[PDB]
């Protein structure tokens, strides 16, 4: 309902983002799109620094130019933070 705002958008994918802690979220994303308009929004709506947010993917860094549909695994991501301490 209004609280939550679940009804649009098709073709899309879920990422599974695992913190180091115990921490564990779920996001959704057009397959075309480039991650920096939902990462640095969701660092704006948070109110946190990536410097200290350290993800990666397959254990390897991953970037913001890297569109999921260049990358093809349909969906499920399990990208992981490791986190600076406590705070999230």
Request: include cysteine; proline fraction near 3%.
């Given at each position: 309902m209004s609280d939550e705002k679940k009804g649009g958008e098709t073709e899309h994918i879920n990422l599974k983002?695992?913190?180091?802690?115990?921490a564990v979220v779920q996001f959704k994303i057009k397959k075309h799109t480039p991650l920096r308009k939902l990462m640095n929004a969701?660092?704006?709506?948070?109110?946190?620094?990536?410097?200290?947010?350290?993800?990666?993917?397959?254990?390897?860094?991953?970037?913001?130019?890297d569109t999921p549909t260049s990358l093809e695994m349909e969906e499920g991501?399990?990208?992981?933070?490791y986190q600076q301490q406590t705070g999230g």
């Open positions: 983002v695992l913190g180091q802690d115990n969701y660092c704006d709506r948070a109110g946190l620094s990536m410097q200290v947010v350290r993800f990666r993917f397959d254990g390897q860094p991953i970037n913001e130019n991501d399990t990208i992981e933070v």
